[PDB]
């Protein structure tokens with residue numbers, strides 16, 4: 035097998051999808067084959083489609099998913115609203131393992147946070163990471179509260195021996211502001227800050243997004259994910 | 261001793277201070293002597309003063325602070341900005357142990373989340389709760405993301421054997437939207453939900469706030485918090 039990473043966030047709207055696209059785009063420019071899997075997608079009625087973002091922004095074509103619910107709620111609530119069940123644990127783990135292959139970087143994007151229910155009954159992206167022996171990239175904010183949330187997610191990961199592959203500041207404000215700059219320094223004291231992605235990068239076209247992504251990550255670290 | 265409760269939250273601005281005032285008010289109405297302490301206060305140069313607000317809202321007079329920093333940042337960054345030190349771990353425990361007394365409910369409000377650094381090195385409100393053998397009342401939102409934050413916070417508490425006293429939904433909207441309602445039912449399955457304080461409770465006057473506090477909690481739970 036190759037390399038599998040779960041891309042998780044300290045919360046909702048922290049930039050997980052932009053970070054999947056940014057790391058995919060950088061790995062692709064490093065000559066690395068990339069797949070992104072998003073097992074469960076919500077908010078389809080208003081048009082949320084995270085795989086399509088990665089496709090447009092990064093150019094990934096191996097884009098794999100299992101379920102789509104209309105309501106903009108957490109998976110289990112959106113499923114109950116529609117009157118249908120979440121996918122099974124086995125579907126998710128086997129899908130990801132089939133995507134995985136030597137030389138390929140496989141990114142798994144969950145929904146919202148580390149401990150939200152992804153599959154019936156009560157299986158989370160942490161459970162999925164355990165099952166596929168994946169490491170975890172943690173997307174954080176740079177705003178007030180992020181040190182607590184980061185440390186909480188990092189403890190949850192270690193408790194199930196899910197290795198932390200680093201942090202990414204999903205959105206970096208312009209201009210920074212005194213909270214953000216202080217938090218960037220403090221985040222780097224509790225784990226590796228792999229990138230801070232400029233605010234608004236999701237509006238970029240494919241070429242500008244590729245340029246941004248190539249600069250946003252250290253060259254050696256990406257190539258070494260393998 | 262009496263009963264010590266640390267009041268912590270899933271994030272900043274979730275209503276820890278309103279909850280302290282509200283639980284204090286309900287305990288006071290039950291005849292229970294209440295003390296509220298705030299070991300680390302930041303933002304004082306914009307008027308941030310949680311003890312003073314608990315006093316305004318619930319009439320609590322036994323209020324105890326220790327560290328105060330001007331800038332509205334995490335305690336560690338607010339100290340650095342002012343050229344001051346964080347308190348030592350034993351200074352926080354002394355502040356709480358001096359208030360602890362039989363028949364008294366002593367509330368300890370944290371500083372913006374359970375693992376925020378309160379003392380050096382990396383000492384948190386969770387360590388303090390271990391030191392004073394307090395349980396933790398966890399204040400949460402009803403908006404999306406609360407289930408993840410709540411479970412991460414509850415796992416962190418169990419990891420150091422700090423008992424969870426239950427959940428308080430800090431701000432409860434009227435009317436409740438679909439997500440709030442779904443989160444509330446799901447939070448109830450994660451731990452006991454002790455209260456869901458109506459949004460905008462900070463604008464109630466002393467009478468209305470105290471009536472809201474009486475209704476907000478189960479009297480049997482309040483009265484059972486301390487003999």
Ligand SMILES: Nc1ccn([C@H]2C[C@H](O)[C@@H](COP(=O)(O)OP(=O)(O)O)O2)c(=O)n1
Pocket residue numbers: 043045046047048049050051052053146204205206231232233234235236237
């Ligand atoms: N560097 C960034 C990060 C997020 N954004 C935008 C993109 C979206 O509109 C919001 C939230 O980002 P995103 O959809 O990736 O958040 P989650 O996948 O839910 O974690 O912020 C951006 O434009 N530039």
Ligand SMILES: Nc1ccn([C@H]2C[C@H](O)[C@@H](COP(=O)(O)OP(=O)(O)O)O2)c(=O)n1
Pocket residue numbers: 269271272273274275276277278279430431432457458459460461462463
């Ligand atoms: N049930 C509630 C909860 C919060 N508020 C107001 C009061 C404040 O202006 C903000 C934040 O609440 P609070 O100061 O207690 O938040 P934290 O102590 O930082 O957790 O919301 C309210 O009016 N009614």
Ligand SMILES: [Mg+2]
Pocket residue numbers: 276277310369
């Ligand atoms: Mg407060």
